């Protein structure tokens, strides 16, 4: 017997844990999922228990690990996003990056709403920290998805 | 026969059941003789005085109060009475009389019919109260 409040929190915690586990495991995957080769994963979960932004971020991280010219990679990513039908994007990469000191680099394409509950709704955001030569490079990707309609527009027929 | 309306001041909902009867007027299980403090007693009696004590010999009234402090409760009770009597008149007595009563109430003041919409604003961090921040010495 466990109370409702207690249960809910516990469930949330479990969800979080699962997510983290997935992140740890699947560096080679276009990960989003969270709905329940894979046999091992299932076993692990049992033991424990008794277009998208995250994927893009992961891809970026992988690219960084591989060792590209950075800017080019970012551009490619942006292009991909555009192809996948995004109204707007934004990527940031801050960290060490070539020089020792500082250096945050923005990469926007289409328009990116930041403030309001629309932002909360109509953007998928993701954050990965790609470990590299002499520290960490800091990805953050932010995608504005196709709307189910924005509050700013007033479409007269 | 029997009519149920509420008052409302802050939190403090006084629900006035106004029925056919002899003219007693009560609170939960107690007469309006009590209320509590002698000073504020007039704020409860005022609508009755305005309307006339003979008009309420046809109407019994019970009032159930819940929530709030003292003064707020009194106000709520008053409001309930004001809404109550008028509501009764609108249904089971004539319209002209009701109108007259309403006019009288308006002449005296607001708050009897229409409600006080004020309520305790949320306290904000960096302070004790709503607006009152802490203190900087530099």
């Amino acid at each position: 017997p466990i109370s409702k409040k207690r249960k809910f929190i516990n469930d949330g915690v479990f969800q979080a844990e699962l997510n983290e586990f997935l992140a740890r495991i699947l560096a080679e995957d276009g990960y989003s999922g969270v709905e329940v080769r894979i046999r091992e994963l299932t076993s692990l979960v049992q033991k424990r228990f008794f277009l998208c932004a995250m994927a893009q971020a992961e891809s970026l991280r992988y690219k960084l690990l591989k060792g590209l010219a950075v800017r080019r990679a970012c551009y490619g990513v942006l292009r991909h996003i555009m192809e996948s039908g995004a109204k707007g994007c934004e990527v940031i990469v801050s960290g060490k990056l070539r020089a020792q000191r500082a250096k945050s680099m923005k990469f926007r394409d289409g328009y990116l709403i930041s403030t309001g509950e629309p932002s909360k709704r109509f953007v998928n955001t993701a954050t990965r920290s790609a470990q590299l030569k002499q520290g960490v490079l800091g990805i953050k990707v932010k995608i504005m998805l196709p709307t189910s309609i924005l509050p700013d527009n007033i479409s007269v027929l | 026969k029997r009519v149920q309306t509420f008052g409302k001041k802050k939190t403090a909902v006084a629900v006035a059941t106004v029925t056919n009867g002899k003219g007693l007027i009560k609170l939960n299980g107690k007469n309006l003789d009590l209320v509590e403090p002698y000073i504020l007693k007039t704020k409860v009696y005022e609508p009755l005085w305005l309307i006339g004590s003979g008009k309420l010999k046809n109407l019994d009234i019970r009032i159930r109060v819940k929530g709030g402090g003292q003064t707020s409760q009194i106000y709520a009770i008053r409001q309930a009475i004001g809404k109550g009597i008028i509501s009764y008149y609108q249904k089971y007595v004539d319209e002209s009389t009701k109108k007259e009563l309403k006019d009288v109430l308006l002449r005296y003041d607001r708050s009897l019919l229409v409600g006080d919409t004020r309520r305790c604003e949320p306290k904000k961090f960096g302070g004790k109260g709503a607006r009152a921040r802490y203190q900087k010495s530099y």
């Binding site: 409702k4 409040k5 249960k7 809910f8 | 961090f125 960096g126």
Partner: protein, 98 residues
């Protein structure tokens, strides 16, 4: 029947569906009664450090408990419950005479 959940609209939809199911036949269904939403509030202080004018942030996980009654046999109620449904809305059926 008690329907505990986190997401309001979804819960409402579920309730509606069950009502519809009931209205088929044989079910004296009392209307959906939504219960007092006992909101889990956490007030955490933002900022890992102690720097910056200490802004807090009131999170609220607001659980919606929903309740609904019936005079029926178990199998039928089970069938009714089967609207497919998903991991989000937590259902519990009580099959008591009292």
């Amino acid at each position: 029947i008690a329907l505990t959940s986190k997401n309001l609209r979804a819960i409402e939809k579920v309730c509606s569906d069950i009502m519809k199911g009931a209205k088929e036949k044989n079910l004296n269904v009392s209307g959906p009664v939504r219960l007092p939403v006992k909101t889990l509030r956490i007030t955490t202080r933002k900022s890992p450090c102690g720097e910056g004018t200490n802004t807090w942030d009131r999170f609220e996980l607001r659980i919606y408990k929903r309740l609904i009654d019936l005079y029926s046999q178990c199998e039928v109620v089970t069938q009714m419950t089967s609207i497919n449904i998903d991991p989000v809305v937590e259902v519990e059926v009580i099959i008591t005479d009292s």
